[PDB]
RNA sequence: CGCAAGACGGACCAGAGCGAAAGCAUUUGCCAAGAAUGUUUUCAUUAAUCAAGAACGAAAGUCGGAGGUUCGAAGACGAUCAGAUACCGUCGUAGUUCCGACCAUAAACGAUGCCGACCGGCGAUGCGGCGGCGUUAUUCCCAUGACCCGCCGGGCAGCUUCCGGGAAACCAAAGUCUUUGGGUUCCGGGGGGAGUAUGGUUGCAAAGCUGAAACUUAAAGGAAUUGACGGAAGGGCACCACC
């Protein structure tokens, strides 16, 4: 039976998205289909930081953050639980959770 | 190095794989405004002294 | 709902509805009279021009147009006729 | 046995067919 | 067996006098046993050496590239060669629900210096807009390319190898792009993000001595 | 082994390249320029445990090593290069990044600007894998 | 540090568009369309769907030319294994690439023919045109963008609802259907046998379209519900668990 009223995907009026490969995996999963996530975060996280800021020769240097967009796959996303299964209400939340 | 003795003003909950590490709120007996959160094993209350070693480290919050 | 004014309704309620789909289709379209500074006399001019207009002994360039309404140039003023 | 690969196991064996009906030519 | 490292010359780089901070960092170089020449073994490096490490005190996203050009001896003259961003700065500032517009101009100096500037510029979700989007028309982005582009062949014609790099720190390119584009797509987050040296000309030392001194 | 500034109050810049890949782990001081190297050691040169070469740990003895070799020589600060396993492959640094970046952190091996030199395709050529990838 | 190679076109990039579908994402140019829209211009039923008949049609495959960097059927080897001409790894042939022809098939799916009418609501958005305060933009005031309130036309989807339907899941279309007729094309008739046999036909071949029957069988199936189960996700309880 159909699962989903969009087909586990992202386009109505396209036919063809070229697909972006997986991150985890390497499989050939769709554009609009895969799971993407775009991290926005520190090189060094919390523990790091309180002592690199010593050895800082500037005046108090904010360090760069790294940007990763990745490209998850859907036996991958659940692999890593990235995403999960909900109920069949649950299921239709576009809402991201903070 | 220093070895310092933060005094337990609150105890944050419990932590570890099989749940005896206490998450705790630890205030430095040389500076009563500076503090850090810390594990800590064994049965601790509110208002004791732990040893410390050194205060590089700093437990993860949850 | 149940009882609407499809005989007589309001003029502010058929104006805002599509120049096809009124009581009667009647067009959004009009003739305005673009008067200019080379000659003195009127050329009564379609609204959505989509062309166009030329004054006498080459005294000025009145319209440029664009998609739907036209232009007029900074002094072409239009005087709109009603019937 | 999956539809796809019955139906490559009946291609393969039109193959044969064909080639025990080439002889009498 | 034996130390390698007793044949180091540590010579003290130079940065051109046209800018404020002298100092860059100390450099080995293979000392003149056999052949191979203490000029001819320091003529090949390319220096990544950031924004506030040259101009006096500004931003501190913004990175430039020099070479080694002319070997006196203890000074190494540092020539312009490229200039590039930092990507903590280039991933941060392209985000979604916006209009990324990159010009590339292969165009030539007053001497034979042809560089390859690189232009970057960004759609604003304006002050009171409401709407998520924040997109262009294709015709509206060919005229801020096309002009884009016409500003960054301006700044290479007109003057020298001297002030296009007075105009390189600056928003001295950028700005006038950011400026003559508001009539088309208010665009706020705009950049030249990259310089490539592709044509260097005969080496005049009688040139690089004002430029370091 | 002759480095000419007094020890008062100059500071002399380096560069160092953390490779964390998934697999290894290399730490690389060499010149400003790059194109004349200091020295470089790996997770293998320290420890001999094939699947624990790019472990936090053989990570933390590269940047203590060269940061004991280093010295020998008289570099004060280094520039960070951070590169991951690049390419078509995944942009993410292995684990052992942050430790030994934590680890010359530890010597107090002045730190410089900070950047990724990670060799990320414009736009990438087919990816080693297949269609379907890597089944398990 | 540069040199050569030819692939690919990230993030921007969306429940965004365009194209008959397939498909189409590097900037500058050129050739020829195309909808949507606006129109107090024309023509005056010229139309809708359509056996025969045709154009295009992912990928793989074939044939001849050029190029083979990445990739990877077949093949080789290392493990894992009882065994894996398997999953994992290392190479690697055709292939992947371009040109010239063939091929005409895909879960070519929205598993939903096409033109027309009618029957709820709303927030969005995409394009065009209109109307409506101000803000900034070239200030040198306007023409006008970028926002902004709404309106209208058509498209892409959305959200809600005792419109109504339906076996249900669901769907403003799958609705207006025992209160059964707006038009028109294709097509189904229990499961297998079987897209098989055969003839006909196209193809260089692989194969495509057309396409049975004998015999066989009491079910095959659709949707949903409860349980059991999972080498599914999450939340608990216990010194017959652990610390």
Same mark, same amino acid.
């Given at each position: 039976?159909?699962?989903?009223?969009?087909?586990?995907?992202?386009?109505?009026?396209?036919?063809?998205?070229?697909?972006?490969?997986?991150?985890?995996?390497?499989?050939?999963?769709?554009?609009?289909?895969?799971?993407?996530?775009?991290?926005?975060?520190?090189?060094?996280?919390?523990?790091?930081?309180?002592?690199?800021?010593?050895?800082?020769?500037?005046?108090?240097?904010?360090?760069?953050?790294?940007?990763?967009?990745?490209?998850?796959?859907?036996?991958?996303?659940?692999?890593?639980?990235?995403?999960?299964?909900?109920?069949?209400?649950?299921?239709?939340?576009?809402?991201?959770?903070? | 190095?220093?070895?310092?003795?933060?005094?337990?003003?609150?105890?944050?909950?419990?932590?570890?794989?099989?749940?005896?590490?206490?998450?705790?709120?630890?205030?430095?007996?040389?500076?009563?405004?500076?503090?850090?959160?810390?594990?800590?094993?064994?049965?601790?209350?509110?208002?004791?002294?732990?040893?410390?070693?050194?205060?590089?480290?700093?437990?993860?919050?949850? | 709902?149940?009882?609407?004014?499809?005989?007589?309704?309001?003029?502010?309620?058929?104006?805002?509805?599509?120049?096809?789909?009124?009581?009667?289709?009647?067009?959004?379209?009009?003739?305005?009279?673009?008067?200019?500074?080379?000659?003195?006399?009127?050329?009564?001019?379609?609204?959505?021009?989509?062309?166009?207009?030329?004054?006498?002994?080459?005294?000025?360039?009145?319209?440029?147009?664009?998609?739907?309404?036209?232009?007029?140039?900074?002094?072409?003023?239009?005087?709109?006729?009603?019937? | 046995?999956?539809?796809?690969?019955?139906?490559?196991?009946?291609?393969?064996?039109?193959?044969?067919?064909?080639?025990?009906?080439?002889?009498?030519? | 067996? @034996?130390?390698?490292?007793?044949?180091?010359?540590?010579?003290?780089?130079?940065?051109?006098?046209?800018?404020?901070?002298?100092?860059?960092?100390?450099?080995?170089?293979?000392?003149?046993?056999?052949?191979?020449?203490?000029?001819?073994?320091?003529?090949?490096?390319?220096?990544?050496?950031?924004?506030?490490?040259?101009?006096?005190?500004?931003?501190?996203?913004?990175?430039?590239?020099?070479?080694?050009?002319?070997?006196?001896?203890?000074?190494?003259?540092?020539?312009?060669?490229?200039?590039?961003?930092?990507?903590?700065?280039?991933?941060?500032?392209?985000?979604?629900?916006?209009?990324?517009?990159?010009?590339?101009?292969?165009?030539?100096?007053?001497?034979?210096?042809?560089?390859?500037?690189?232009?970057?510029?960004?759609?604003?979700?304006?002050?009171?807009?409401?709407?998520?989007?924040?997109?262009?028309?294709?015709?509206? @982005?060919?005229?801020?390319?096309?002009?884009?582009?016409?500003?960054?062949?301006?700044?290479?014609?007109?003057?020298?190898?001297?002030?296009?790099?007075?105009?390189?720190?600056?928003?001295?390119?950028?700005?006038?792009?950011?400026?003559?584009?508001?009539?088309?797509?208010?665009?706020?987050?705009?950049?030249?993000?990259?310089?490539?040296?592709?044509?260097?000309?005969?080496?005049?030392?009688?040139?690089?001595?004002?430029?370091?001194? | 082994?002759?480095?000419?500034?007094?020890?008062?109050?100059?500071?002399?810049?380096?560069?160092?390249?953390?490779?964390?890949?998934?697999?290894?782990?290399?730490?690389?001081?060499?010149?400003?320029?790059?194109?004349?190297?200091?020295?470089?050691?790996?997770?293998?040169?320290?420890?001999?445990?094939?699947?624990?070469?790019?472990?936090?740990?053989?990570?933390?003895?590269?940047?203590?090593?060269?940061?004991?070799?280093?010295?020998?020589?008289?570099?004060?600060?280094?520039?960070? #290069?951070?590169?991951?396993?690049?390419?078509?492959?995944?942009?993410?640094?292995?684990?052992?990044?942050?430790?030994?970046?934590?680890?010359?952190?530890?010597?107090?091996?002045?730190?410089?600007?900070?950047?990724?030199?990670?060799?990320?395709?414009?736009?990438?050529?087919?990816? #080693?894998?297949?269609?379907?990838?890597?089944?398990?």
């Amino acid at each position: 039976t159909k699962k989903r009223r969009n087909n586990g995907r992202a386009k109505k009026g396209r036919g063809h998205v070229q697909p972006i490969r997986c991150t985890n995996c390497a499989c050939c999963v769709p554009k609009d289909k895969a799971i993407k996530k775009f991290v926005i975060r520190n090189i060094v996280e919390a523990a790091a930081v309180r002592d690199i800021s010593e050895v800082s020769v500037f005046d108090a240097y904010v360090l760069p953050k790294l940007y990763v967009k990745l490209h998850y796959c859907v036996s991958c996303a659940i692999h890593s639980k990235v995403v999960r299964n909900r109920s069949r209400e649950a299921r239709k939340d576009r809402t991201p959770p903070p | 190095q220093p070895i310092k003795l933060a005094r337990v003003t609150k105890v944050l909950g419990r932590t570890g794989s099989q749940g005896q590490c206490t998450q705790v709120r630890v205030e430095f007996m040389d500076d009563t405004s500076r503090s850090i959160i810390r594990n800590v094993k064994g049965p601790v209350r509110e208002g004791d002294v732990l040893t410390l070693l050194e205060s590089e480290r700093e437990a993860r919050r949850l | 709902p149940l009882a609407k004014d499809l005989l007589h309704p309001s003029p502010e309620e058929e104006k805002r509805k599509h120049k096809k789909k009124r009581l009667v289709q009647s067009p959004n379209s009009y003739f305005m009279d673009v008067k200019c500074p080379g000659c003195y006399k009127i050329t009564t001019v379609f609204s959505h021009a989509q062309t166009v207009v030329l004054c006498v002994g080459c005294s000025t360039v009145l319209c440029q147009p664009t998609g739907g309404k036209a232009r007029l140039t900074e002094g072409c003023s239009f005087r709109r006729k009603q019937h | 046995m999956r539809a796809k690969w019955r139906k490559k196991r009946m291609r393969r064996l039109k193959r044969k067919r064909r080639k025990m009906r080439q002889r009498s030519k | 067996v @034996v130390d390698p490292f007793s044949k180091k010359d540590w010579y003290d780089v130079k940065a051109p006098a046209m800018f404020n901070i002298r100092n860059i960092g100390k450099t080995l170089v293979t000392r003149t046993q056999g052949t191979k020449i203490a000029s001819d073994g320091l003529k090949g490096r390319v220096f990544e050496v950031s924004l506030a490490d040259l101009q006096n005190d500004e931003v501190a996203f913004r990175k430039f590239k020099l070479i080694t050009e002319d070997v006196q001896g203890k000074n190494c003259l540092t020539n312009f060669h490229g200039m590039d961003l930092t990507r903590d700065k280039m991933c941060s500032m392209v985000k979604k629900w916006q209009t990324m517009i990159e010009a590339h101009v292969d165009v030539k100096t007053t001497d034979g210096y042809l560089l390859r500037l690189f232009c970057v510029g960004f759609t604003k979700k304006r002050n009171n807009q409401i709407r998520k989007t924040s997109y262009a028309q294709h015709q509206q @982005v060919r005229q801020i390319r096309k002009k884009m582009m016409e500003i960054m062949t301006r700044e290479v014609q007109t003057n020298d190898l001297k002030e296009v790099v007075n105009k390189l720190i600056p928003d001295s390119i950028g700005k006038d792009i950011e400026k003559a584009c508001q009539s088309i797509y208010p665009l706020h987050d705009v950049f030249v993000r990259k310089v490539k040296m592709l044509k260097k000309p005969k080496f005049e030392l009688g040139k690089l001595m004002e430029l370091h001194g | 082994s002759l480095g000419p500034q007094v020890a008062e109050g100059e500071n002399v810049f380096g560069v160092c390249h953390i490779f964390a890949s998934f697999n290894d782990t290399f730490v690389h001081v060499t010149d400003l320029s790059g194109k004349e190297t200091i020295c470089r050691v790996t997770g293998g040169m320290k420890v001999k445990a094939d699947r624990d070469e790019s472990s936090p740990y053989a990570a933390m003895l590269a940047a203590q090593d060269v940061a004991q070799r280093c010295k020998e020589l008289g570099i004060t600060a280094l520039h960070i #290069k951070l590169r991951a396993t690049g390419g078509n492959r995944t942009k993410t640094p292995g684990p052992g990044a942050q430790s030994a970046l934590r680890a010359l952190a530890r010597s107090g091996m002045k730190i410089g600007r900070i950047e990724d030199v990670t060799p990320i395709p414009s736009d990438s050529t087919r990816r #080693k894998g297949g269609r379907r990838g890597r089944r398990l």
